[PDB]
Amino acid sequence: SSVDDMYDFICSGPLISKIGLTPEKVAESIDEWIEYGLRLCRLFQLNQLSLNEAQKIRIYHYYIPVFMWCEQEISQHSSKFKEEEEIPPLVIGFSAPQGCGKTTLVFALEYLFKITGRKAATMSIDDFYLTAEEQAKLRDSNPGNLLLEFRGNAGSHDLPFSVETMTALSKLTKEGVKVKLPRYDKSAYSGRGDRADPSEWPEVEGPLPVILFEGWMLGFKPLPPEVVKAVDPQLETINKNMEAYYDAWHKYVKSWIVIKIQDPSYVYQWRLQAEIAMRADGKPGMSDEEVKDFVSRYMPAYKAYLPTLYSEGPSGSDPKHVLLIDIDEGRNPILGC
């Protein structure tokens, strides 16, 4: 794979048309492309010279174009202020379902921002879950609603904490000003989970320009209860909760990326394979029925709310500031325009 070849490969990606880039721009920044490819190959210990098609597709059709788009969004963000005018952090929200490269993407995205001189901070929505006692009390309020027994569906999120955490992130415009990133431990209490103790949390200094905000439920909007009741009775409370999520997250996210999957059932598949790989290699792996329950409990929310994203779009979104990445069954960007 010579420089020229890679150029061609880059130009055939499904996202070149979609980030606003052109063959001349690719030719003029091919040095940046190849250096970013080197950095991502080392970030995964890949070979550059010995990449199979999946690795090349991730690096040059999936990761780097998204990094380019995000950096352009921060560029147009910071172009709107003057000298000595402090720049608020830009929060880019990633609305993608579970286990679709969403998580490892942001790990790759965050890394390139660090390399290219923009301090980056990552926060999953799961880090704002109700603590174990608060989660238990939320369950107790709805003893007949399974989906609220455990995490993820609307209600299991500590919204006042989320609002304070998002507000404090914004005031990182000078140096010295800090904010601790609330980490959430998912294995606490036999695997149920509790917030990581606040004295174990990573902390970010200075002025931070970009914030990466991911979650399986971002962009999901309040629907009329008539779509809700028929998909699942146990969503109607979960529907009424997300009406209060319109205001704690959608206000704060400016730029958006929506990994859009083909059929929601993939989630189950993607989970099982992973656990199967664990069980094949002989590692802690959830049983088939365990995984089935786990996924089949978030599925009631997916089938309710994923249709809305593809139809209209995320709630607190601006159409020119939302990127749509259609991924195939191998989590690779589809050339679906």
Partner 1 sequence: SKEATRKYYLDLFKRADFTANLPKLAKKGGPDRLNDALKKLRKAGISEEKFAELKGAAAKYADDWYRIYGK
Least distance from partner 1 to the Cβ atom of residue 48, Å: 10
CB-count burial class (<10 Å; 0-12, 13-18, 19+) for 96: buried
CB 106 within 8 A of CB 212: yes
Candidates 4, 175, 203, 281: give the one binding partner 1 (CB under 8 A).
4
By CB under 8 A, which span of 5-13, 158-166, 195-203, 264-272 interacts with partner 1?
Answer: 5-13
By CB under 8 A, which span of 24-32, 153-161, 162-170, 258-266 interacts with partner 1?
Answer: 24-32
Least distance from partner 1 to the Cβ atom of residue 3, Å: 5
Least distance from partner 1 to the Cβ atom of residue 191, Å: 48
Coil vs helix vs strand at 157: strand
By CB under 8 A, which span of 4-12, 55-63, 94-102, 295-303 interacts with partner 1?
Answer: 4-12
Least distance from partner 1 to the Cβ atom of residue 16, Å: 9
Closest to partner 1 by CB, 3 vs 54, is 3
d(CA 31, CA 182): 37
CB 93 within 8 A of CB 85: no
Quote the strand ranges of the chain, DSSP E. Answer: 90-95, 120-124, 179-180, 184-185, 194-195, 203-204, 210-215, 255-260, 322-326
- DSSP β-bridge partners for residue 308: none
Candidates 2, 50, 190, 311: give the one binding partner 1 (CB under 8 A).
2
Within 13 Å, how many C-alpha atoms sit on residue 18's CB side?
Answer: 25
Told to check if 3 binds partner 1 by CB under 8 A, we report: yes
Least distance from partner 1 to the Cβ atom of residue 328, Å: 22
By CB under 8 A, which span of 22-30, 66-74, 121-129, 181-189 interacts with partner 1?
Answer: 22-30
- DSSP β-bridge partners for residue 260: 326
Cα dihedral value 317, 329, 46, 23, nearest 10: -60
CB 69 within 8 A of CB 323: yes
Candidates 20, 23, 233, 330: give the one binding partner 1 (CB under 8 A).
23
Closest to partner 1 by CB, 4 vs 175, is 4
**Strand 210-215 with 184-185, pairing:** unpaired
Could you tell me which of 203, 215, 35 has the C-alpha nearest to residue 119? 203
The interface with partner 1 within residues 31-70 (CB under 8 A) comprises: 31, 34
Amino acid in position 26:
V
Over its C-alpha atoms, the chain yields an Rg (Å, rounded) of 20
Least distance from partner 1 to the Cβ atom of residue 326, Å: 20
Closest to partner 1 by CB, 4 vs 281, is 4
Least distance from partner 1 to the Cβ atom of residue 41, Å: 14
Least distance from partner 1 to the Cβ atom of residue 27, Å: 6
Told to check if 244 binds partner 1 by CB under 8 A, we report: no
By CB under 8 A, which span of 26-34, 115-123, 224-232, 314-322 interacts with partner 1?
Answer: 26-34
Told to check if 276 binds partner 1 by CB under 8 A, we report: no
Question: Under 8 Å CB-to-CB from 167, ≥6 apart: which residues?
Answer: none
Residues that bind partner 1 in the complex, under the rule CB under 8 A:
2-4, 7-8, 11, 23-24, 27, 31, 34
